[PDB]
Write a protein that binds this ligand. Structure first.
Ligand SMILES: NC(=O)c1ccc[n+]([C@@H]2O[C@H](COP(=O)([O-])OP(=O)(O)OC[C@H]3O[C@@H](n4cnc5c(N)ncnc54)[C@H](OP(=O)(O)O)[C@@H]3O)[C@@H](O)[C@H]2O)c1
Ligand SMILES: O=C(O)COc1cc(F)ccc1C(=O)NCc1cccc([N+](=O)[O-])c1
Ligand SMILES: O=C(O)COc1cc(F)ccc1C(=O)NCc1cccc([N+](=O)[O-])c1
Length: 316
């Protein structure tokens, strides 16, 4: 399969990237170095992950070593919720650029549609534990993102965790200058996202699947929870193809025309997870994997469920 997908800004994006949420700061530099050595050309980052400085050390060292050229890398980061204000967006992007030791990002996403009160705390709370919103709306934040393209800080802009009505709100924005290039959403066999994916693809927006292995290291995992990597039905498809369960879980979104960003800090898994370009799942395999949907969503925050822009009350 071709390694890159064409975005609606005219640039090509590698369909396989390395995730970095939860990658410890003392391990992520070597994880990213190994990833680049074994062929990864796309790294998914965020300020809220608190490890961009260490990701940046790896990127810079591989550029200095001339393992890769900057134009061959596709570096993604995200604007955190406490920076949705007009006057804060550029500085938030600049801090990410400084930490990653880059002069531009290939793609910068609104991380969540929910804006929060600015300040030091990433989740400002009231005394009952509700997140404290900011009055900013998704359209003014979008205008601020467009300015970053026009200032040369980012080559593409997009969104993450937007439901179809929130995507539509931007597409219908008066005076829209740049369409979102990407919507990055949770997607795996237990949360297959058909409706939102078809909506986005019909509008020319590329979808990136996050948590493709079900995020088994998420901090709120419970022992009894569903496990994609241990599902015997997925293991059987993997065995039939002489691949690992993770390799099937990564190839699955690729064949839906999605980008996919599995996370690992384990060098042998980083290399394993990249070995997915030389086998195909049949149409029957694909439909069988889709049949496992249970609307099982792993990534959301209870503190945000009354925010006016909370994305997951809508069906899709
Ligand atoms: N936009 C958003 O709101 C958002 C939300 C969630 C995630 N994301 C992005 O998506 C990335 C991926 O999602 P995620 O981190 O939630 O989880 P994930 O990629 O679904 O799963 C990561 C977990 O799978 C393990 N793993 C990786 N390869 C494996 C293999 N071959 N065999 C067995 N276990 C394997 C990792 O272990 P080891 O690391 O110990 O090897 C880790 O515990 C994130 O890191 C982040 O970049 C974005
Ligand atoms: O958001 C991510 O990329 C992964 O999840 C997190 C990563 C972090 F470093 C810290 C927190 C989270 C987390 O709780 N993420 C979930 C989340 C965030 C913001 C808004 C909402 N919401 O439901 O509106 C949900
Ligand atoms: O709520 C958070 O901040 C992170 O997510 C959890 C934290 C926990 F301590 C326990 C469970 C979760 C959890 O299930 N999170 C995923 C989730 C899916 C769908 C809806 C919600 N919600 O909060 O409305 C949350």
């Amino acid at each position: 399969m071709a390694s890159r997908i064409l975005l609606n800004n005219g640039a090509k994006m590698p369909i396989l990237g390395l995730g970095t949420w939860k990658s410890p700061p003392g391990q992520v530099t070597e994880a990213v170095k190994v990833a680049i050595d074994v062929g990864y050309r796309h790294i998914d980052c965020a300020h809220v992950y608190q490890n961009e400085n260490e990701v940046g050390v790896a990127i810079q060292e591989k550029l200095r070593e001339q393992v890769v050229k900057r134009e061959e890398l596709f570096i993604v980061s995200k604007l955190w919720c406490t920076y949705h204000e007009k006057g804060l967006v550029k500085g938030a992007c600049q801090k990410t650029l400084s930490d990653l030791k880059l002069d531009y990002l290939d793609l910068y996403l609104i991380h969540w549609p929910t804006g929060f009160k600015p300040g030091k705390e990433f989740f400002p709370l009231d005394e009952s534990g509700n997140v404290v919103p900011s009055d900013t709306n998704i359209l003014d934040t979008w205008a601020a993102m467009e300015e970053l393209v026009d200032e040369g800080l980012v080559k593409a802009i997009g969104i993450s965790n937007f439901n179809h009505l929130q995507v539509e709100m931007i597409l219908n924005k008066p005076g829209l200058k740049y369409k979102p290039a990407v919507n990055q959403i949770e997607c795996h066999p237990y949360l297959t996202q058909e409706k939102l994916i078809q909506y986005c693809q019909s509008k020319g927006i590329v979808v990136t699947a996050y948590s493709p292995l079900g995020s088994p290291d998420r901090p709120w995992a419970k022992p009894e929870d569903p496990s994609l990597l241990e599902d015997p039905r997925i293991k059987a498809i993997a065995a039939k193809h002489n691949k690992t369960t993770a390799q099937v879980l990564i190839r699955f979104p690729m064949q839906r025309n999605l980008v996919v960003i599995p996370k690992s800090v384990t060098p042998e898994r980083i290399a394993e997870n990249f070995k997915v370009f030389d086998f195909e799942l049949s149409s029957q395999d694909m439909t069988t994997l889709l049949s496992y949907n249970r609307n099982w969503r792993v990534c959301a925050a209870l503190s945000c469920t009354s925010h006016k822009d909370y994305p997951f009350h809508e069906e899709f």
